[model samples]
Target: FEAWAKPVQPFAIWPGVWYVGTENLSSVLLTTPQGHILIDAGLDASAPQIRRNIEALGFRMADIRYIANSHARLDQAGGIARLKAWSGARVIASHANAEQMARGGKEDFALGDALPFPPVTVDMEAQDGQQWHLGGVTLAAIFTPGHLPGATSWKVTLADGKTLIYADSLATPGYPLINNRNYPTLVEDIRRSFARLEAQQVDIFLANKGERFGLMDKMARKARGENNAFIDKAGLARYVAQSRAAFEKQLAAQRAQP
Candidate 1:
């Protein structure tokens, strides 16, 4: 029997997940009967530390079966090759992100050439709505392309219920409000995304960079028109109105600012 890895945090998040170092940084470990699937390998600098942490939990290098990245970024996937080399795990990513990985890793023209670093091989390319089944668990892929095009979130269902992995959906506390900059059609897209989540009876919201998962009971209540402080049926209407008002004020303030 293998021991499961625990989250190390300041940096606190939910079970098997940790927000490490930076507030916008997080890593999730899915312990399955097949093995462990790690989402996001963290920065290259943190590789040694992360490896040590995993080893402490009785999980040797080989226990990691898949390394899934949200998007291709230094902070999100820098240690991928290290993890791949150590664990011999497949690097699972979206098609676009896989291309980015090949470009960054220079796996094309330099086919026979040795990489300056270890090479991470892509074994799986997840398409929209792809479902991964391992150890009695099923994870559904949801394409939420706003923070970055081709960004995908996974909907994992355990023995209990569903947890929606919302990577970079809500801005990390102090990060810039990216309501429009990164996304071509931002405001409306965000609204639609919110509405989609509202439609589902999500038990937990797996925010990529946080300690606590949002208990979706309140959100479910708000959606069902029961009783919710943030947004009752009536409250949501007013909240939308207030949001529009706030948007106008923000535009005016921007115009006034020197």
Candidate 2:
């Protein structure tokens, strides 16, 4: 309910849905007429505080219908177990991440220790490009790998427009931004991911990690060359093509190596 930073006061994307967290990271709260859905639990220690904030906003823990993690990373998914143990909400994670969570859901797996809380056992396994109806909202899953093998982005389409709940795929400051440093020409892989999104109509971009939320309308306008600072479609296209080619070459080389 608090902005915690200037120029980024807590705002509502949809009528009941809210985003509560510091500018460094964010988590989604969908308060529909029927139920509620939470996308990405914030830091591990903040889980209890988040639960309190939800109740203050007129939602109950039991009403939290779904809790999703963008990937298995702690900054985004760290509080999964704590939130689930407190709310009894169903946790929705990528099929690939279930194993990672099961290995004790450890932030540092080297020292295996169960999290103080228990993450809700994923009652449902979500696939890429799946659609779900949460009362009035329609959420479409966009599978974006390469960041994390099975990282998923949720697209929420309401009467207003569309909000792409892109998690680590668009980390702002602290999150790792490099795409292909360890391997040659791998930078193109990240470009392909961005290009895929550019082809879609994204109104608002809710990145899970960052100091600022990228308003897609602003990005789109920049794409049209309306702004001197924005990257145009042609430039975006070049990056996309480069990424796809680099990815193919990288894979081919690996196949031949071992």
Candidate 3:
């Protein structure tokens, strides 16, 4: 976890979407004149760094109106409560994950409080396909449960008709997948999420962390004046295929166990 603790100056992923995260984690800032929205928060220890990152971008922490997350796991939602306290932002999350958040990461199907953090009451629960309008921009939530029950992927469409898919983490390393007592529906849920994500026509595919979607490579290309450096016409499909293969591989291994 400390490997990603190094600070990274904020950079713009899109016209208004800034990467205000760390080297490993990705906290996005969707800016608007009315206010700002922070997509995900890293570890609790990373909150101060995130504040510094946002402030460096000339954004006031109080201007953050909402703090949402991909899932309620500590790695992503650990700092939500602190960020909320500092910004007075409403925390938005899926009902399933919100329960975990409210308890500070307890009662999780997989992790089971292995790494608890400060919890916050989720002010707004997002429904599948819910389109929330904020300062001339609309962020849509797509329920993609698998990695966790409340795992969600966010989407947004720009004026140029391009779409961005902030796909949630899909890796299931060491997760139980056969006759699992913790999450019986995990296999099925992940399969269903694969279909849901495969259907999105993503102009730019993003992940909770930068490396998952070639952030560094894209940033280098962008620095060289490449047009649409982050855009990958086939990114969504490939990512899903890889994730599907990984899930199936682990499931097969679990099934082979005596």
Candidate 4:
């Protein structure tokens, strides 16, 4: 996991969105005239790098007005408290995720044993379909469970005609080791989430982990002066289809036992 947590240089993934994430975990900055909205703070120890990444992009940490979490995992939202302290940013998350984050993942079926830091309080509880608007930028929260009860995806509309969809969590099924937990309904939830994603007109697709959808490879191609291959509608459909298939396969394996 350390390899995935290794620091990487920050860059502009889109006109207004910047990728300031570590290798394993993902963090993004959505710049606006009011201030920047930072999505997903890395591990607790990752605060310094996240600061450096923002500064490297000619932005100040103090300009961050909000810190939004993608989920309640330490690898994803662990440093939120530290970042909030540093920037005085309001922490926003779904009600369910807020509860898990407040308890430092104690309620999480898989991450309970690996809390990164003490629980952090959530300043704002986002409801499903809630929209946050700042400086002409708007992001609509979409409730997507499975990875965690209150997992969320964001549908962002930039000033340009481009639309970006940040899928909540379509990770491989490894958590909730015992069958009595949330695993029973995970497969169904994932498929429903995929359907929701497919219904959107996403010009750019992003996930909590870039490698989940080959984002790094697509970004590399863009660096070579090629058009953003990540903007493919068909690719988005394929990703959802492939993810659904993988989820079904894992579900079958899980049910086959016992």
Top-TM-score candidate index: 3
Indicate the TM-score of model 4. Answer: 0.91
Per-residue CA lDDT of model 3 for 17-96, tens digit only, reads 88888888878888878888889899999899999889998999898888889999888998888888899988888999
Candidate 1 structure quality by residue, lDDT tens digits, 1-106: 0111223433223343333322334566666658777777656665665677676555676977888877655556667878788888888887856765665533
- In candidate 3, how many Å is residue 94 off? 0.2
Q: Model-by-model lDDT, in order?
A: 0.53, 0.58, 0.86, 0.80
Error of 3 at 233 (Å): 2.7
User: Candidate 2 — what's its lDDT?
Assistant: 0.58
Off by over 4 Å in 1: 1-24, 105-121, 162-166, 170-192, 211-258
Query: CA shift at 26, candidate 4, in angstroms?
Result: 1.2
User: Which of the two, 1 or 2, has more TM-score?
Assistant: 2
Residue 190 of model 2 has an lDDT of 48
Prediction 3 TM-score vs. true: 0.96
Where does the lowest 10-residue lDDT sum fall in candidate 3?
A: 155-164
Q: Tell me, what's the RMSD of every candidate?
A: 9.7, 7.9, 1.3, 2.1
TM-score of 1: 0.63
Q: Is candidate 3 or candidate 4 better by TM-score?
A: 3
Candidate 3, superposed: residue stretches over 4 Å from native: none
Q: What is the lDDT of residue 1 in candidate 2?
A: 18
By lDDT, the best candidate is 3
- Candidate order by TM-score, decreasing, is 3, 4, 2, 1
Question: What is candidate 4's lDDT per residue for 144-238, written digit by digit as tens?
Answer: 77677788888888767688777777666575423546456665666678888778888878878877667678778878876666675566677
